[PDB]
Amino acid sequence: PFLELDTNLPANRVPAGLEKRLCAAAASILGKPADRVNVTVRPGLAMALSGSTEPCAQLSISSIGVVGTAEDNRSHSAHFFEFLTKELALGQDRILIRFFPLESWQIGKIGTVMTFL
Amino acid sequence: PFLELDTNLPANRVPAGLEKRLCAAAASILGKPADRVNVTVRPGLAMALSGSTEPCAQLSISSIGVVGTAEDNRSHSAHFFEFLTKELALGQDRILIRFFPLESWQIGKIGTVMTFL
Amino acid sequence: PFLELDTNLPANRVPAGLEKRLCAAAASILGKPADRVNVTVRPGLAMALSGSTEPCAQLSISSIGVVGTAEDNRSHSAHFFEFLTKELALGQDRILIRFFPLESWQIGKIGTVMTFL
Protein backbone atom coordinates (compact mmCIF):
# COMPACT_ATOMS: atom_id res chain seq x y z
CA PRO A 1 0.00 0.00 0.00
CA PHE A 2 0.93 3.69 -0.35
CA LEU A 3 0.88 6.01 2.66
CA GLU A 4 1.54 9.75 2.37
CA LEU A 5 1.81 11.94 5.47
CA ASP A 6 1.85 15.75 5.27
CA THR A 7 2.59 17.69 8.44
CA ASN A 8 3.39 21.21 9.59
CA LEU A 9 5.54 19.77 12.34
CA PRO A 10 9.15 20.63 11.43
CA ALA A 11 11.31 17.64 10.57
CA ASN A 12 12.95 17.81 14.02
CA ARG A 13 9.55 17.25 15.67
CA VAL A 14 8.81 14.11 13.65
CA PRO A 15 10.44 11.25 15.60
CA ALA A 16 13.40 9.58 13.94
CA GLY A 17 12.43 6.35 12.24
CA LEU A 18 8.73 7.17 11.87
CA GLU A 19 8.56 6.09 8.24
CA LYS A 20 9.82 2.59 9.14
CA ARG A 21 7.48 2.27 12.13
CA LEU A 22 4.59 3.33 9.90
CA CYS A 23 5.43 0.45 7.53
CA ALA A 24 5.14 -2.02 10.40
CA ALA A 25 1.95 -0.38 11.66
CA ALA A 26 0.31 -0.34 8.23
CA ALA A 27 1.25 -3.98 7.64
CA SER A 28 -0.67 -5.10 10.74
CA ILE A 29 -3.61 -2.72 10.24
CA LEU A 30 -4.17 -3.43 6.54
CA GLY A 31 -3.10 -7.07 6.44
CA LYS A 32 -0.39 -6.46 3.85
CA PRO A 33 3.30 -7.45 4.05
CA ALA A 34 5.52 -4.78 5.56
CA ASP A 35 7.90 -5.17 2.61
CA ARG A 36 5.10 -3.97 0.29
CA VAL A 37 4.30 -0.85 2.35
CA ASN A 38 5.44 2.51 1.02
CA VAL A 39 5.52 5.61 3.25
CA THR A 40 6.21 9.22 2.27
CA VAL A 41 6.51 11.86 5.01
CA ARG A 42 6.53 15.55 4.01
CA PRO A 43 7.31 17.69 7.11
CA GLY A 44 7.74 21.44 7.63
CA LEU A 45 4.74 22.35 5.45
CA ALA A 46 2.33 25.24 5.98
CA MET A 47 -0.99 23.73 6.99
CA ALA A 48 -4.43 24.52 8.30
CA LEU A 49 -6.60 21.65 9.47
CA SER A 50 -10.20 22.41 10.41
CA GLY A 51 -9.37 26.09 9.90
CA SER A 52 -6.51 26.08 12.44
CA THR A 53 -2.74 26.32 11.83
CA GLU A 54 -1.80 24.51 15.06
CA PRO A 55 0.35 21.38 14.56
CA CYS A 56 -1.52 18.78 12.51
CA ALA A 57 -1.07 15.96 10.02
CA GLN A 58 -2.86 14.54 6.97
CA LEU A 59 -2.56 10.86 6.02
CA SER A 60 -3.53 9.35 2.67
CA ILE A 61 -3.77 5.57 2.27
CA SER A 62 -4.04 3.86 -1.13
CA SER A 63 -4.28 0.09 -1.64
CA ILE A 64 -5.91 -2.67 -3.67
CA GLY A 65 -8.91 -4.38 -2.16
CA VAL A 66 -8.75 -3.30 1.49
CA VAL A 67 -9.65 0.44 1.70
CA GLY A 68 -12.91 0.40 -0.23
CA THR A 69 -15.57 -0.09 2.47
CA ALA A 70 -16.87 2.11 5.28
CA GLU A 71 -16.83 -0.76 7.77
CA ASP A 72 -13.20 -1.71 7.32
CA ASN A 73 -12.03 1.89 6.85
CA ARG A 74 -13.59 2.61 10.25
CA SER A 75 -11.31 -0.08 11.70
CA HIS A 76 -8.25 1.17 9.80
CA SER A 77 -8.94 4.73 10.93
CA ALA A 78 -9.12 3.76 14.62
CA HIS A 79 -5.76 1.99 14.44
CA PHE A 80 -3.97 4.69 12.42
CA PHE A 81 -5.26 7.40 14.78
CA GLU A 82 -3.87 5.44 17.74
CA PHE A 83 -0.50 5.17 16.02
CA LEU A 84 -0.25 8.76 14.79
CA THR A 85 -1.57 10.58 17.87
CA LYS A 86 1.09 8.93 20.01
CA GLU A 87 3.96 9.09 17.49
CA LEU A 88 3.39 12.75 16.57
CA ALA A 89 2.15 13.93 19.99
CA LEU A 90 -1.03 15.25 18.34
CA GLY A 91 -4.61 15.14 19.52
CA GLN A 92 -7.24 13.28 17.53
CA ASP A 93 -8.66 16.65 16.43
CA ARG A 94 -5.41 17.40 14.57
CA ILE A 95 -5.29 14.41 12.18
CA LEU A 96 -7.37 13.47 9.15
CA ILE A 97 -7.12 10.47 6.83
CA ARG A 98 -8.24 9.85 3.25
CA PHE A 99 -8.62 6.35 1.76
CA PHE A 100 -8.15 5.66 -1.97
CA PRO A 101 -8.81 2.26 -3.57
CA LEU A 102 -6.44 1.31 -6.37
CA GLU A 103 -6.70 -1.22 -9.18
CA SER A 104 -3.83 -3.34 -10.45
CA TRP A 105 -3.61 -1.49 -13.79
CA GLN A 106 -2.84 1.72 -11.85
CA ILE A 107 0.34 0.44 -10.14
CA GLY A 108 3.56 0.59 -12.13
CA LYS A 109 6.36 -1.57 -10.80
CA ILE A 110 9.52 -2.99 -12.39
CA GLY A 111 8.69 -1.40 -15.74
CA THR A 112 5.22 -2.95 -16.10
CA VAL A 113 1.94 -2.82 -14.16
CA MET A 114 0.60 -5.20 -11.51
CA THR A 115 -2.05 -6.52 -13.92
CA PHE A 116 0.75 -8.58 -15.50
CA LEU A 117 2.54 -9.69 -12.33
CA PRO B 1 -12.80 20.08 2.05
CA PHE B 2 -9.12 19.35 1.38
CA LEU B 3 -6.94 21.82 -0.51
CA GLU B 4 -3.33 21.08 -1.45
CA LEU B 5 -1.13 23.74 -3.05
CA ASP B 6 2.27 22.91 -4.59
CA THR B 7 4.47 25.80 -5.68
CA ASN B 8 8.01 26.51 -6.83
CA LEU B 9 7.83 29.88 -5.16
CA PRO B 10 10.20 29.73 -2.17
CA ALA B 11 8.49 29.92 1.20
CA ASN B 12 9.54 33.58 1.55
CA ARG B 13 7.55 34.45 -1.61
CA VAL B 14 4.34 32.86 -0.32
CA PRO B 15 2.63 35.60 1.73
CA ALA B 16 2.42 34.99 5.46
CA GLY B 17 -0.97 33.68 6.49
CA LEU B 18 -1.94 32.31 3.07
CA GLU B 19 -3.13 28.98 4.44
CA LYS B 20 -5.63 30.73 6.75
CA ARG B 21 -6.86 33.09 4.02
CA LEU B 22 -7.33 30.09 1.72
CA CYS B 23 -9.61 28.51 4.35
CA ALA B 24 -11.81 31.59 4.33
CA ALA B 25 -11.75 31.77 0.54
CA ALA B 26 -12.61 28.09 0.10
CA ALA B 27 -15.45 28.36 2.62
CA SER B 28 -17.18 31.06 0.56
CA ILE B 29 -16.43 29.48 -2.83
CA LEU B 30 -17.47 25.93 -1.94
CA GLY B 31 -20.23 26.70 0.55
CA LYS B 32 -18.56 24.76 3.36
CA PRO B 33 -17.75 25.99 6.89
CA ALA B 34 -14.30 27.52 7.22
CA ASP B 35 -13.69 25.32 10.28
CA ARG B 36 -14.00 22.24 8.04
CA VAL B 37 -11.50 23.50 5.43
CA ASN B 38 -8.05 21.93 5.36
CA VAL B 39 -5.17 23.56 3.46
CA THR B 40 -1.68 22.18 2.80
CA VAL B 41 0.93 24.42 1.15
CA ARG B 42 4.17 22.86 -0.12
CA PRO B 43 6.56 25.65 -1.25
CA GLY B 44 10.11 25.62 -2.63
CA LEU B 45 9.46 22.67 -4.97
CA ALA B 46 10.96 22.11 -8.42
CA MET B 47 8.14 22.55 -10.91
CA ALA B 48 7.33 22.85 -14.57
CA LEU B 49 3.84 23.94 -15.55
CA SER B 50 2.93 23.85 -19.23
CA GLY B 51 6.55 22.94 -19.94
CA SER B 52 7.96 26.05 -18.21
CA THR B 53 9.86 26.33 -14.91
CA GLU B 54 8.81 29.95 -14.26
CA PRO B 55 6.99 30.50 -10.94
CA CYS B 56 3.74 28.54 -10.85
CA ALA B 57 1.33 26.73 -8.54
CA GLN B 58 -0.88 23.63 -8.60
CA LEU B 59 -4.05 23.42 -6.50
CA SER B 60 -5.99 20.23 -5.73
CA ILE B 61 -9.47 20.42 -4.21
CA SER B 62 -11.27 17.39 -2.73
CA SER B 63 -14.74 17.48 -1.19
CA ILE B 64 -18.02 15.62 -0.83
CA GLY B 65 -20.85 16.64 -3.10
CA VAL B 66 -19.66 19.99 -4.48
CA VAL B 67 -16.74 19.35 -6.91
CA GLY B 68 -18.34 16.73 -9.13
CA THR B 69 -19.87 18.77 -11.98
CA ALA B 70 -18.39 20.78 -14.84
CA GLU B 71 -20.81 23.65 -14.30
CA ASP B 72 -20.03 24.24 -10.65
CA ASN B 73 -16.31 23.46 -11.04
CA ARG B 74 -16.24 26.22 -13.67
CA SER B 75 -17.52 28.61 -10.98
CA HIS B 76 -15.11 27.31 -8.34
CA SER B 77 -12.21 27.62 -10.78
CA ALA B 78 -12.99 31.27 -11.58
CA HIS B 79 -13.04 32.20 -7.89
CA PHE B 80 -9.91 30.24 -6.93
CA PHE B 81 -7.99 31.73 -9.86
CA GLU B 82 -8.97 35.22 -8.69
CA PHE B 83 -7.75 34.42 -5.18
CA LEU B 84 -4.49 32.70 -6.15
CA THR B 85 -3.34 35.03 -8.94
CA LYS B 86 -3.51 37.99 -6.57
CA GLU B 87 -2.17 36.23 -3.45
CA LEU B 88 0.79 34.60 -5.23
CA ALA B 89 1.41 37.38 -7.79
CA LEU B 90 1.08 34.82 -10.60
CA GLY B 91 -0.60 35.12 -13.97
CA GLN B 92 -3.55 32.91 -14.86
CA ASP B 93 -1.24 30.95 -17.19
CA ARG B 94 0.83 29.81 -14.18
CA ILE B 95 -1.88 28.06 -12.12
CA LEU B 96 -3.79 24.82 -12.64
CA ILE B 97 -6.45 23.17 -10.48
CA ARG B 98 -7.67 19.58 -10.15
CA PHE B 99 -11.01 18.65 -8.55
CA PHE B 100 -11.57 15.31 -6.78
CA PRO B 101 -14.97 14.20 -5.44
CA LEU B 102 -14.85 12.24 -2.20
CA GLU B 103 -17.34 9.91 -0.53
CA SER B 104 -17.97 9.74 3.20
CA TRP B 105 -16.37 6.29 3.56
CA GLN B 106 -13.08 7.79 2.30
CA ILE B 107 -12.70 10.39 5.07
CA GLY B 108 -11.18 9.22 8.35
CA LYS B 109 -11.77 11.53 11.28
CA ILE B 110 -11.65 10.99 15.05
CA GLY B 111 -10.77 7.32 14.63
CA THR B 112 -13.74 6.41 12.42
CA VAL B 113 -15.04 7.47 8.99
CA MET B 114 -17.65 10.09 8.09
CA THR B 115 -20.14 7.38 7.08
CA PHE B 116 -20.76 6.87 10.81
CA LEU B 117 -20.80 10.52 11.91
CA PRO C 1 -0.69 15.63 -18.08
CA PHE C 2 0.30 15.99 -14.41
CA LEU C 3 3.41 14.27 -13.05
CA GLU C 4 4.35 14.36 -9.36
CA LEU C 5 7.66 12.90 -8.15
CA ASP C 6 8.41 12.38 -4.44
CA THR C 7 11.93 11.37 -3.47
CA ASN C 8 14.12 11.00 -0.40
CA LEU C 9 17.11 11.99 -2.47
CA PRO C 10 18.18 15.43 -1.23
CA ALA C 11 17.72 18.22 -3.75
CA ASN C 12 21.46 18.19 -4.51
CA ARG C 13 21.20 14.55 -5.67
CA VAL C 14 18.38 15.29 -8.12
CA PRO C 15 20.12 16.38 -11.35
CA ALA C 16 19.65 20.00 -12.34
CA GLY C 17 16.98 20.41 -14.99
CA LEU C 18 15.18 17.13 -14.25
CA GLU C 19 11.72 18.72 -14.25
CA LYS C 20 12.24 20.04 -17.80
CA ARG C 21 13.66 16.74 -19.08
CA LEU C 22 10.68 14.94 -17.54
CA CYS C 23 8.35 17.17 -19.58
CA ALA C 24 10.09 16.11 -22.78
CA ALA C 25 10.11 12.47 -21.71
CA ALA C 26 6.43 12.46 -20.75
CA ALA C 27 5.49 14.16 -24.03
CA SER C 28 7.00 11.32 -26.07
CA ILE C 29 5.80 8.52 -23.78
CA LEU C 30 2.20 9.72 -23.42
CA GLY C 31 1.74 11.32 -26.83
CA LYS C 32 0.90 14.73 -25.38
CA PRO C 33 2.51 18.09 -26.23
CA ALA C 34 5.46 18.98 -24.01
CA ASP C 35 3.91 22.41 -23.43
CA ARG C 36 0.94 20.71 -21.74
CA VAL C 37 3.08 18.60 -19.38
CA ASN C 38 3.26 19.61 -15.73
CA VAL C 39 5.94 18.21 -13.41
CA THR C 40 6.27 18.64 -9.64
CA VAL C 41 9.38 17.29 -7.88
CA ARG C 42 9.42 17.12 -4.07
CA PRO C 43 12.94 16.14 -2.88
CA GLY C 44 14.47 15.67 0.57
CA LEU C 45 11.45 13.77 1.94
CA ALA C 46 11.49 10.92 4.46
CA MET C 47 10.49 7.79 2.57
CA ALA C 48 10.23 4.04 2.80
CA LEU C 49 9.56 2.10 -0.37
CA SER C 50 8.91 -1.63 -0.06
CA GLY C 51 9.72 -1.30 3.64
CA SER C 52 13.20 0.17 3.02
CA THR C 53 14.46 3.74 3.58
CA GLU C 54 17.23 3.50 0.96
CA PRO C 55 17.03 6.15 -1.79
CA CYS C 56 13.81 5.80 -3.78
CA ALA C 57 11.20 7.74 -5.73
CA GLN C 58 7.43 7.68 -6.29
CA LEU C 59 5.89 8.97 -9.53
CA SER C 60 2.21 9.78 -10.05
CA ILE C 61 0.85 10.38 -13.56
CA SER C 62 -2.59 11.87 -14.23
CA SER C 63 -4.03 12.51 -17.70
CA ILE C 64 -7.17 12.39 -19.82
CA GLY C 65 -7.64 9.37 -22.03
CA VAL C 66 -4.18 7.77 -22.03
CA VAL C 67 -3.53 6.25 -18.56
CA GLY C 68 -6.68 4.18 -18.18
CA THR C 69 -5.69 0.75 -19.54
CA ALA C 70 -3.35 -1.97 -18.30
CA GLU C 71 -1.87 -2.52 -21.76
CA ASP C 72 -0.84 1.07 -22.39
CA ASN C 73 0.15 1.70 -18.76
CA ARG C 74 2.52 -1.26 -19.11
CA SER C 75 4.17 0.61 -22.00
CA HIS C 76 4.23 3.93 -20.14
CA SER C 77 5.73 2.23 -17.08
CA ALA C 78 8.58 0.67 -19.08
CA HIS C 79 9.54 4.03 -20.57
CA PHE C 80 9.27 6.02 -17.33
CA PHE C 81 11.34 3.42 -15.48
CA GLU C 82 14.05 3.72 -18.14
CA PHE C 83 14.05 7.50 -17.76
CA LEU C 84 13.96 7.64 -13.96
CA THR C 85 16.43 4.85 -13.16
CA LYS C 86 19.09 6.58 -15.24
CA GLU C 87 18.27 10.18 -14.24
CA LEU C 88 18.09 9.45 -10.50
CA ALA C 89 20.74 6.69 -10.41
CA LEU C 90 18.19 4.34 -8.80
CA GLY C 91 17.55 0.68 -9.40
CA GLN C 92 14.20 -0.50 -10.73
CA ASP C 93 13.41 -1.86 -7.24
CA ARG C 94 13.47 1.70 -5.85
CA ILE C 95 10.76 3.32 -8.02
CA LEU C 96 6.99 2.92 -8.13
CA ILE C 97 4.41 4.63 -10.33
CA ARG C 98 0.68 5.26 -9.95
CA PHE C 99 -1.61 6.15 -12.87
CA PHE C 100 -4.75 8.28 -12.44
CA PRO C 101 -7.23 8.94 -15.27
CA LEU C 102 -8.78 12.40 -15.26
CA GLU C 103 -11.92 13.79 -16.89
CA SER C 104 -12.20 17.24 -18.43
CA TRP C 105 -14.52 18.54 -15.69
CA GLN C 106 -11.74 17.87 -13.15
CA ILE C 107 -9.14 20.18 -14.72
CA GLY C 108 -9.34 23.87 -13.86
CA LYS C 109 -7.43 26.14 -16.20
CA ILE C 110 -7.69 29.87 -16.96
CA GLY C 111 -10.57 30.29 -14.52
CA THR C 112 -12.83 27.63 -16.04
CA VAL C 113 -12.63 23.86 -16.62
CA MET C 114 -11.53 21.94 -19.71
CA THR C 115 -15.12 20.83 -20.40
CA PHE C 116 -15.69 24.34 -21.79
CA LEU C 117 -12.42 24.77 -23.69
Residue numbers in the entry:
A (entry chain A), B (entry chain A), C (entry chain A): 1 to 117
Quote the study that presented this structure, word for word.
Crystal structures of the wt proteins show that the side chains of wt-MIF and wt-MIF-2 are similarly oriented, suggesting that the intermolecular forces stabilizing both relays between the enzymatic and allosteric sites are consistent. A major difference between MIF-2 and MIF is the replacement of the solvent channel of MIF with a large solvent cavity in MIF-2. Because it is primarily the addition of a large side chain at Phe2 that pushes the channel outward, the solvent cavity of wt-MIF-2 does not contain any more waters than wt-MIF (41 versus 42) despite the expansion in the upper cavity. This is also likely because the bottom of the MIF-2 channel is largely blocked by Arg42, causing this cavity to appear truncated relative to MIF, which instead has a valine at the same position. Another interesting feature is the dense region of waters in a horizontal layer just above the Arg42 side chain of MIF-2. This is due to an increase in charged, hydrophilic residues in this area of MIF-2 (Arg42, Glu4), while MIF has the hydrophobic Leu and Ile residues at these positions. The N-terminal nitrogen of F100A and S62A differs from that of wt-MIF-2 by 1.7 Å and 0.8 Å, respectively. These differences are influenced by tartrate in the wt-MIF-2 active site with two hydrogen bonds from the Pro1 nitrogen to the tartrate carboxylate (2.9 Å) and carbonyl (2.7 Å) oxygens that stabilize its position. wt-MIF-2 is the only protein in this study that has tartrate in its crystallization conditions. To understand the loss of ∼60% of enzymatic activity in F100A relative to wt-MIF-2, the superimposed wt-MIF-2 and F100A structures were examined using tartrate (from crystallization conditions of wt-MIF-2) in the electropositive active site as a guide. Seven wt-MIF-2 residues with atoms within 4 Å of the tartrate were compared with the same residues of F100A. We next assessed the crystallographic water networks for wt-MIF-2 and three variants and found wt-MIF-2 to have the densest network of water molecules.
